[PDB]
Symmetry: D2
């Protein structure tokens, strides 16, 4: 009994095996550091409106996926307080542009775990039973236990949201896709530091018959989402 | 002691530690399947001139990097002949599009190791002592020994070339960057299935003070390349 | 519809979900370099009879598992001909004890891929459709595509054989076990360079209620193996 | 040249004598109440706690000396997320069958669960600021963790292993590090196991084939030959 979501470039998931037990929502880096005033992204001068746009659409998707018993996953980009997991190059680039990782700012130490700006925003806050991944990189798989958690939960399908589209969401999508996870990007549930770059990251997914998976949007997903009993 | 390459958005590498012993050139997927007549990409109708453009610029970079004793790395996307490393979704999408992985075409079985179309093109062919990575995914790190080879060679700096810009080159850049490798993308030594997508993948690198490293071009690299002796 | 194999310290697999589609036999490093005259192990002076002992038991297990449609996996420890994947410490230790990796011997370059001594012995030779893993380390997961192949084949159960019990078989078991694979070591289908060490690697598995899985033997497995429904 | 060696078996460690505070780390593996304390995981399965407490004083001497000479210090804890999302079904089931269920309530709290009293590192070997702690869901410290990433960023080449248990957590971690090219030293008096025979055999496995996983030495030999920083 297969179920499909209207998507581009093909009906998602590819084989219609869409159930709450094999499908997860992943909300990527909806932190004050990426979309709040005083955080990492605001420091570099980027338009916070572009990364706040996805907040309400992700909320509708989260509420619907929570209600139908789907697996829910959240990620935070961040570093250990002693910065032992912070590559030297990553730190130096952040310092040069005036937004140094580990440096004090209005929301505390930029991109440091346990600091106010680093935490997930209240509107999209995790509840009990939802796995949070704390990652030192852009991709959620690198140096984390995400893949191990996904295997133990026997998850085959991943629906990606969050920020930024072209950096954190996209790297995570490519990692999942390479390892065989079947992925759906929701275009209205993500935003980037450059709007052209946001749209191009979406288009990259559609090439070669869906090279990294397929693309849809929050309304199309929620109107066709299956529950536990069919 | 330090050496820099003129790059955008900062002089590369970040700390000027640029030597033949800690720096590698990586040539990504310069295979007939990605830029030849009769292969995977030609099958899907994409403009072969966009992916052939980088051939001569890569050749000039390779000749200069070979001459100064730099580490040279090549990659081929491909699958085991029995297709045991081919995720079901990857295969199905390629079939829908009319360019099925493992299916017979003019250059043999599409994207299958040991087939004519799968091999690296003659102009950029590896010589003895240059490591070739055979990868089942878009990123060169996933399910390969690339990282292990890089650590044994004590390589810190990576200069990326090849195709496609927004798929194979970009995923590999994000993997390397996340693990702390300091990377340089040469914009004239890569090309993609959509030219807009090629330029946007280049621009994505430059954001946030060089989120995935820095960008330059073949001439700027070759004119400022150090040898072992100052 | 559960099936169990009589094993120590518990009936294997834990949950009785034992089928040809989710279970693989893994034959580890049955190469001339580990059990042949003139190879790596014979060079270090070890008793070849200890590592030849498992040949007939593995043959019976392989024939039965091949006949009932089970997944079959083989591994070879070895290095790229240019030795780019050979850590400096590994090489140096092999040279000190007179069995240098890459060095010429009676069966060719020790532990080098493509050389006679490196290949799997004739008695246990792979047939088409059986995945061979070429690994640069002791564990079959490190820097390989084993895990990726396992996931695409939806394999949950692994039955380990080969040499050496305490080095290559054991490392591979611990990697699989950590990632959640349910493993069975067949005690008569493995052997080591020290017989005490072989018996202790078997005992290590049984501790803490089966810390790495369970232990059984070739006869117990073959008489209780489930086949397909015709 | 400016090389330093530690007297070890079967060869002087490290192999190439490149032994400095900046490229060498001490790793203390799973010295948690759950592995060596009263009321924890290991005590639940009936094992002799004296075998796993033996290494406490030797590790203390090695830690004090390595802390004093500016060496990198690493600690690990085996454990699981409170919702048990990182706990394989087989691992859980085996722990339940032998009466020491992971996540189940006991005297020191939920067995092998992060944030619980029994799960934490014992007081005698407690981490100080600037020492990386790895929280791992498996026996090997590399699997599903950021250990390797931290090691690379710190440009660490040499690892000196201590902790428990010798044949399970220490040994798996050694094999992972060794495979990826790290040069490793096991200190035999700074580790202990649930079976003493198994502890001695895990030590012997290291020495085979000219040091298949590295070399073996002991706390006294290490501390008297440890190079310091140049003031
Ligand atoms: Cl200078
Ligand atoms: Cl104390």
């Amino acid at each position: 009994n297969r179920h499909f979501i209207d998507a581009d470039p093909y009906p998602w998931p590819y084989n219609g095996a869409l159930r709450p037990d094999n499908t997860a929502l992943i909300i990527i880096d909806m932190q004050t550091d990426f979309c709040g005033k005083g955080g990492y992204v605001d420091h570099m001068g980027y338009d916070l409106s572009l990364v706040q746009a996805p907040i309400e659409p992700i909320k509708r998707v989260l509420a619907a996926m929570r209600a139908k018993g789907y697996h829910i996953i959240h990620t935070r980009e961040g570093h250990r307080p002693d910065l032992a997991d912070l590559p030297a190059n990553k730190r130096w680039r952040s310092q040069r542009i005036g937004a140094g990782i580990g440096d004090p700012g209005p929301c505390g130490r930029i991109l440091t775990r346990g600091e106010p700006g680093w935490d997930i925003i209240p509107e999209l806050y995790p509840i009990e039973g939802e796995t949070i991944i704390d990652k030192p990189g852009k991709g959620s798989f690198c140096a984390t236990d995400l893949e191990l958690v996904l295997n133990q939960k026997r998850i085959e399908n991943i629906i990606l949201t969050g920020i930024t589209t072209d950096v954190c969401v996209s790297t995570t999508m490519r990692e999942a896709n390479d390892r065989g996870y079947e992925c759906l990007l929701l275009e209205d549930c993500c935003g980037a530091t450059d709007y052209g770059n946001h749209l191009a990251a979406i288009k990259m997914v559609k090439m070669q018959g869906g090279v990294f998976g397929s693309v849809s949007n929050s309304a199309a997903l929620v109107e066709a989402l299956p529950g536990l009993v069919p």
